[PDB]
Write a protein that binds this ligand. Structure first.
Ligand SMILES: CC(=O)N[C@@H]1[C@@H](O[C@@H]2O[C@H](CO)[C@H](O)[C@H](O)[C@H]2O)[C@@H](O)[C@@H](CO)O[C@H]1O
Ligand SMILES: CC(=O)N[C@@H]1[C@@H](O[C@@H]2O[C@H](CO)[C@H](O)[C@H](O)[C@H]2O)[C@@H](O)[C@@H](CO)O[C@H]1O
Ligand SMILES: CC(=O)N[C@@H]1[C@@H](O[C@@H]2O[C@H](CO)[C@H](O)[C@H](O)[C@H]2O)[C@@H](O)[C@@H](CO)O[C@H]1O
Ligand SMILES: CC(=O)N[C@@H]1[C@@H](O[C@@H]2O[C@H](CO)[C@H](O)[C@H](O)[C@H]2O)[C@@H](O)[C@@H](CO)O[C@H]1O
Lengths: 14, 133, 133, 14, 14, 133, 133, 14
């Protein structure tokens, strides 16, 4: 789709 | 012309620009998507008036640009963008302006346009495109 | 807690957050860089007060975060982020909070933090980091 | 430095 | 999926 | 130890490494995906033997790693990676080794591991991960 | 023609291709950089002979391509790439072939070409470029 | 330069 994607690391805290 | 650089965002929601069937492309103002929110960038105005405006409202995020093309030529001796065409996965907007001169095209097989930069004086002098996944 | 997602930007200029030496991390508000301009994101507030605030003003763009670390533990039965430490290429800010529980660390060899997302109730429940070149 | 970089193609119009 | 994605421009020649 | 850096590829197909329930992680050799083709990288050997090997064959591309975690501790005075766990979207491989010491975890919300680098002497001294969309 | 897709790598070291001053571009074989090592990709051959070859050996990594341009036109009724020019930060290689027809250009302000894909029959039918930081 | 860059996290084990 038209939404730019990002690298996301985590979550921390679970 | 006055240079501008909107920088990068996360997508495109709307593109408004001017054109003159006798000369070239004028000013332009892009409304980007910034993390799900519409973000209206700065209006990069032409030094003059007398243009016809076009407002391309994309059905974000299902609709996105897959190709930008147009023509480059001289107007009053200045090399400028005389015409523009924006093809999305849903339809084609344009051509707008004068389709004469040297053609250029940026088809995108994978990736997205996430920003624009360039220069505008009486007309759009030139422009560059930010690409990102 | 209430989930939040600031999304991605082009850098970090300032990070403000709360901490309680007896409990854990509270609310947080990040000021990102958005194509050269400071962009203050939404304030993700704690459901309560009684915290000590810390304001980390980074010397953008020469200074940037190279590691985020901290501790995860329970407070009133909830698993939350109890402590945080932000190391930049210039200095170290922290630890702030309670350095007890399970440690975590995200050292960055190459790349930049460009966004934060997570959840905050009485305390910071959890968080994720956006990375980009 | 701390400034995120982007792929930029162009310019067209020179 | 597990396949790394790339930005691809073109094709030219159609 | 001897440093290594496999660099970046387009995915992971198989990960083979050694471990000793009494000491730590030993050598490792990764088979990456390189544009649809399996690419067996260099074997980064331990300076010694006596390990138990594990071969993780991922169902590429439907299966991919979503988290790498483990423990860091001292063995004969050297700070090394004593245990490793690889969680994919399909299952969990591990823990392998000694789950004692300081824990670390790299959960991946979005993105892929596309390369490994580090150092191995008698044991895996340390390692870094390449991330990409 | 027979389609090909070299995929993505970490840079370009050498580009070898054929051209005929009377017709168009023929086959091509790219030597990429793969994490510091030269990686010779598959030879995408023309269905015929009679071409003049050109071998562009780039001074990797100090030298890199900043623009690819050329001409598209018909040869025996087939729309193909008739000419190519590769401009680097150090010099310009080309034009090679027939500079007649519709021009195209991909100037790169920031970023690198890291792969090629396309189709080759008697001549180079079309091609796409992989871009990455 | 002409070398493609990558996001690298770590090291863990120091
Ligand atoms: C002062 C100004 O902006 N003039 C505009 C033109 O810009 C001049 O163009 C020349 C080109 O040789 C050169 O790049 C110079 O730096 C520019 O100032 C140009 O933009 C023109 C057409 O749109 O409009 C003038 O107003
Ligand atoms: C209503 C609310 O947000 N309560 C906050 C807690 O959230 C609950 O936590 C449980 C965990 O088992 C579960 O995830 C649920 O969806 C949450 O509502 C939690 O954030 C807590 C500690 O910060 O504060 C409460 O206010
Ligand atoms: C010569 C060699 O590689 N020895 C290995 C150890 O490496 C030494 O470790 C120290 C740490 O203080 C220092 O980093 C030095 O540069 C290294 O040579 C180490 O890898 C050890 C445990 O795996 O094995 C030795 O063989
Ligand atoms: C069988 C074959 O590959 N023929 C080559 C041509 O390909 C045909 O081109 C048409 C175009 O209308 C169509 O795309 C078809 O799928 C192709 O097979 C073409 O590549 C030509 C010029 O290089 O050479 C033929 O050998």
């Amino acid at each position: 789709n038209g939404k730019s994607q990002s690298i996301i690391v985590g979550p921390w805290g679970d | 012309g006055v240079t501008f650089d909107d920088g990068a965002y996360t997508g495109i929601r709307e593109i408004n620009f001017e054109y003159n069937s006798e000369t070239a492309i004028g000013g332009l103002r892009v409304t980007y998507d910034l993390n799900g929110m519409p973000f209206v960038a700065e209006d990069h105005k032409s030094f003059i008036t007398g243009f016809k405006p076009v407002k391309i409202s994309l059905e974000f995020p299902s609709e996105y640009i897959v190709e930008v093309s147009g023509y480059v030529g001289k107007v009053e001796g200045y090399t400028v963008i005389r015409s523009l065409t924006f093809k999305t996965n849903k339809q084609t907007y344009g051509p707008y302006g004068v389709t004469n001169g040297t053609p250029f095209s940026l088809p995108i097989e994978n990736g997205l346009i996430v920003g624009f930069k360039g220069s505008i004086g009486y007309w759009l002098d030139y422009f560059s495109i930010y690409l990102s996944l």
